[PDB]
Design an enzyme around this catalytic site. Structure first.
Site, PDB file in Angstrom:
ATOM      1  N   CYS A  16       0.842  -1.185   0.000  1.00 24.23           N
ATOM      2  CA  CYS A  16       0.000   0.000   0.000  1.00 24.23           C
ATOM      3  C   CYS A  16       0.885   1.245   0.000  1.00 24.23           C
ATOM      4  O   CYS A  16       1.477   1.615   1.024  1.00 24.23           O
ATOM      5  CB  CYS A  16      -0.940  -0.077   1.194  1.00 24.23           C
ATOM      6  N   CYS A  71      -0.067   4.219   2.333  1.00 27.41           N
ATOM      7  CA  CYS A  71       0.129   3.817   3.718  1.00 27.41           C
ATOM      8  C   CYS A  71       1.575   4.005   4.106  1.00 27.41           C
ATOM      9  O   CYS A  71       1.886   4.611   5.140  1.00 27.41           O
ATOM     10  CB  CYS A  71      -0.201   2.333   3.836  1.00 27.41           C
ATOM     11  SG  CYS A  71      -1.948   1.925   3.437  1.00 27.41           S
TER      12      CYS A  71
END
Lengths: 105, 105
Positions: free
Chosen positions: A30, A33
């Site tokens: 991700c 993230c």
């Protein structure tokens, strides 16, 4: 001090805390993230003693992601006394993170 | 007719194919991944023999998701002869998925 918790340790690390807890649901694939890791490090120090930051790796913590109805990451859930009180879904700038924490202390 | 692959089956199911392969990186907790599941089933039939659709559950296939720099889920990666030729990161409507398939196939 940012604890990496697990499905088995979430009760002790998050639900049993009396300091408010900001829980960061992330994954290695991700990109947004990973991109908020620097600001979360800074914020963990800025709010030491006021807010505990805990990370949940959704690859090994799928059960926790489902349990808290995570639908999209980045997901930041604020816990107080073991209940979710606010959430910020999707990455946002530092200034919005600071405002999110301050309103929900 | 959508194949669910694994880290170790990925080469045979995707990389070794001569038909173009649309790979959908998904997870059970992920809501937009549910948003696009029906259209993917329709497209797997509409493009039978022309594009193969394969699914990667990132919960059990973290190595593959990280290897291909998928950014977030759902991630739709189009492979031809074992290389990524185009990609769509995030859910998008049927009409954009059709145009994405046709433009690169």
């Amino acid at each position: 001090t940012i604890v990496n918790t697990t499905d088995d340790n979430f009760q002790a690390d998050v639900l049993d805390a009396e300091t408010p807890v900001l829980v960061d649901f992330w994954a290695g694939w991700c990109a947004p993230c990973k991109a908020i890791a620097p600001v979360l490090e800074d914020l963990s120090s800025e709010y030491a003693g006021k807010v505990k930051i805990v990370k949940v790796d959704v690859t090994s913590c799928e059960e926790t992601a489902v349990k808290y109805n995570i639908r999209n990451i980045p997901a930041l859930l604020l816990f107080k006394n073991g209940e979710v009180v606010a959430q910020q879904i999707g990455a946002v700038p530092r200034s919005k993170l600071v405002s999110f924490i301050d309103e929900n202390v």
